[PDB]
Every structure is written in C-alpha cells, then in structure tokens.
C-alpha cells in the first residue's frame, strides 16, 4: 500500500 514501509513507518510499518 505504501512504497515506503520497512524504512518509513508513517502508519503501519510493521505489516507494510
């Protein structure tokens, strides 16, 4: 859902 997860965790970076 978000190109940036692992690194950038704005909402849910755990289950990106």
């Amino acid at each position: 859902v978000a190109r940036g997860w692992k690194r950038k965790c704005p909402l849910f970076g755990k289950g990106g």
Side-chain angles (χ1 to χ4, degrees):
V1 57
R3 81 204 170 288
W5 273 135
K6 30 261 227 216
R7 286 193 124 180
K8 299 245 84 74
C9 49
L11 0 163
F12 14 87
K14 316 112 202 235

